[PDB]
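User: Is it possible to get a 3D structure for a protein together with its bound compound? The compound here is zinc ion. I've pasted both below.
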Amino acid sequence: GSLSWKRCAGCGGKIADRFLLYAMDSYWHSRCLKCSSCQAQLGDIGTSSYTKSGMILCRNDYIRLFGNSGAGGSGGHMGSGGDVMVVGEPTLMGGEFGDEDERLITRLENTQFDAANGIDDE
Ligand SMILES: [Zn+2]
Ligand SMILES: [Zn+2]
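Assistant: Yes, that's possible. Here is the predicted structure of the complex:
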């Protein structure tokens, strides 16, 4: 698309689908990307993605795996978390583990993004 294809690291490679996602500088499918533990829709919980141990985790997954206590001695470290689970609605803007290690999800599931492999009818 705007650049060269980065292939789905979830399944085979070439994404000839309408539902594409960008993660880790590669491409993924909605259920190809997926969580670590929950196995939910990373692109539906908001825009956020955590990559550690070579794994792909959501915000909740992250707190469960590498959720080091970063709430109490955190004066700043806010704004991070593109999710709509904890930072979607104002609940606690105190920067409780507001790790900026995320922001790896690029999502437009249609011919809006690089989900355009080719336009060919049957
Ligand atoms: Zn895939
Ligand atoms: Zn998860």
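The two ends are 23 Å apart (CA to CA). The first strand starts at residue 20 and ends at 23.
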